[PDB]
Design an enzyme around this catalytic site. Structure first.
Site, PDB file in Angstrom:
ATOM      1  N   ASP A 119     -43.040 121.518 -37.749  1.00 40.18           N
ATOM      2  CA  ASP A 119     -44.455 121.709 -37.413  1.00 40.18           C
ATOM      3  C   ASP A 119     -44.877 123.103 -37.870  1.00 40.18           C
ATOM      4  O   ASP A 119     -44.110 124.060 -37.752  1.00 40.18           O
ATOM      5  CB  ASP A 119     -44.675 121.636 -35.898  1.00 40.18           C
ATOM      6  N   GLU A 124     -44.560  90.324 -53.568  1.00 34.30           N
ATOM      7  CA  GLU A 124     -43.765  90.559 -52.357  1.00 34.30           C
ATOM      8  C   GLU A 124     -43.587  92.040 -52.031  1.00 34.30           C
ATOM      9  O   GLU A 124     -43.053  92.381 -50.976  1.00 34.30           O
ATOM     10  CB  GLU A 124     -42.405  89.863 -52.429  1.00 34.30           C
ATOM     11  N   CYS A 180     -44.488 110.938 -43.572  1.00 36.65           N
ATOM     12  CA  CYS A 180     -43.623 111.762 -44.409  1.00 36.65           C
ATOM     13  C   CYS A 180     -44.431 112.569 -45.421  1.00 36.65           C
ATOM     14  O   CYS A 180     -45.505 112.149 -45.855  1.00 36.65           O
ATOM     15  CB  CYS A 180     -42.624 110.879 -45.146  1.00 36.65           C
ATOM     16  N   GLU A 219     -46.230 103.747 -44.498  1.00 39.33           N
ATOM     17  CA  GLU A 219     -46.216 102.318 -44.818  1.00 39.33           C
ATOM     18  C   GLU A 219     -47.319 101.566 -44.105  1.00 39.33           C
ATOM     19  O   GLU A 219     -47.445 101.667 -42.883  1.00 39.33           O
ATOM     20  CB  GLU A 219     -44.881 101.686 -44.397  1.00 39.33           C
ATOM     21  N   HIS A 235     -41.095 106.215 -53.869  1.00 38.88           N
ATOM     22  CA  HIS A 235     -42.442 106.558 -53.414  1.00 38.88           C
ATOM     23  C   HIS A 235     -42.566 108.071 -53.186  1.00 38.88           C
ATOM     24  O   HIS A 235     -43.647 108.640 -53.308  1.00 38.88           O
ATOM     25  CB  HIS A 235     -42.801 105.754 -52.164  1.00 38.88           C
ATOM     26  N   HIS A 290     -42.628 117.463 -36.058  1.00 41.46           N
ATOM     27  CA  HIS A 290     -43.189 116.115 -36.016  1.00 41.46           C
ATOM     28  C   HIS A 290     -43.624 115.580 -37.375  1.00 41.46           C
ATOM     29  O   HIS A 290     -44.121 114.444 -37.462  1.00 41.46           O
ATOM     30  CB  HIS A 290     -44.337 116.057 -35.009  1.00 41.46           C
ATOM     31  N   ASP A 309     -47.708 101.314 -49.564  1.00 41.97           N
ATOM     32  CA  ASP A 309     -47.811 102.580 -48.845  1.00 41.97           C
ATOM     33  C   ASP A 309     -49.142 103.244 -49.136  1.00 41.97           C
ATOM     34  O   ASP A 309     -49.643 103.188 -50.253  1.00 41.97           O
ATOM     35  CB  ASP A 309     -46.698 103.543 -49.278  1.00 41.97           C
ATOM     36  N   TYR A 340     -34.660 112.971 -46.640  1.00 44.84           N
ATOM     37  CA  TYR A 340     -35.292 113.679 -45.526  1.00 44.84           C
ATOM     38  C   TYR A 340     -34.763 115.095 -45.403  1.00 44.84           C
ATOM     39  O   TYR A 340     -33.558 115.325 -45.563  1.00 44.84           O
ATOM     40  CB  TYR A 340     -34.991 112.979 -44.205  1.00 44.84           C
TER      41      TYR A 340
END
Lengths: 196, 196
Positions: free
Chosen positions: B84, B28, B57, B158, B137, B120, B32, B79
């Site tokens: 950029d 289940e 990411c 993902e 991850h 971005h 990624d 995060y």
């Protein structure tokens, strides 16, 4: 024979369709999918992500972002801190979750505490005066929702080619619109409509 | 007969291949794509975006993020403020630009002033100790790069199904790996390797 008249486009938008939105008539413009934030379903989010950069943004008025306690990410595209709607999301990144968060950002009953920050949606702050003040795709989205009689919130992402990941210019956008039955407008065209 | 042994996977990763990464052996789990940040090309970024959520990411060590002045977005996925790389980007969102930014985040010669914020790309801060401390991850990506002798920076997104936008569980990841010639590993398997 390329661009849909604004009043017809607004009816489509009101009915939960995407519009493909260009800056003006130039062939070299790249196209974004835009639809009403409150109307985006799991399936429509899946579609948006499938055919776009996946960096899915949710234009809101500055007033609405303020109400939701979504400050600018820093203190050009006006990103706020990212977010997920808490109740009914798990990973935040699923089509279901991103759609739910997007609809929630539009819902006038949503409260600041309803959202987890950071998250997986990128709200953007549209300037007061919208397209009469700044001709951004952010302002376009909120303008479209306003003209459609909807909450001042939209959802947007850049069309990308399957072949090579390059952004879709006008010709490819025309082809995409025909294939998927999606109408195309441009910002200059929209400014002309709201002005005079 | 499902998971590639770690040493073979590391050689693939060293050579600029993606790995499909699961948490453990469970059917289940959702998969990624992860590859070395310094090795991602325009084409490889195009591929990543095409088959993923597009919310791309870039795991970095806390130490590296600190050096680059990429603080946590707020003060669970860690995060930083988005960014950029300034020189050689335009829209920031193109496959070319996202790849360039990603490689730049890995480059030991990059300086804080080289980046525009917000942007971005979504850098993530991997905790010190990596997978021995947190089985995310994010930590997996930085661990993979470290084990491969590369800069402690990875890039991740993902896997999503074309049919319906649902994230790919193990069976779909196996099929995706076979179709595209991409090896599959899992985090438990990686922790076993680095431990003992």
């Amino acid at each position: 024979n390329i661009f849909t008249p604004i009043e017809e486009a607004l009816e489509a938008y009101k009915n939960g369709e995407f519009l493909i939105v260009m800056d003006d008539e130039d062939r070299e413009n790249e196209g974004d999918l835009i639809m009403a934030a409150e109307l985006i379903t799991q399936e429509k989010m899946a579609f948006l992500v499938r055919y776009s950069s996946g960096y899915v943004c949710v234009p809101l008025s500055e007033e609405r972002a303020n109400q939701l306690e979504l400050p600018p990410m820093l203190a050009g595209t006006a990103y706020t801190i990212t977010c997920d709607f808490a109740e009914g999301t798990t990973t935040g990144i699923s089509a279901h979750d991103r759609a739910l968060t997007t609809r929630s950002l539009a819902n006038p009953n949503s409260k600041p505490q309803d959202f987890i920050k950071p998250g997986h949606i990128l709200p953007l702050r549209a300037v007061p005066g919208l397209l009469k003040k700044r001709r951004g795709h952010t302002e376009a989205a909120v303008q479209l929702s306003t003209l459609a009689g909807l909450q001042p919130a939209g959802v947007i992402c850049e069309l990308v080619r399957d072949e090579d990941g390059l952004m879709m210019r006008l010709d490819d956008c025309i082809q995409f619109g025909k294939k998927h039955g999606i109408k195309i407008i441009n910002i200059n065209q929209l400014v002309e409509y709201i002005s005079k």
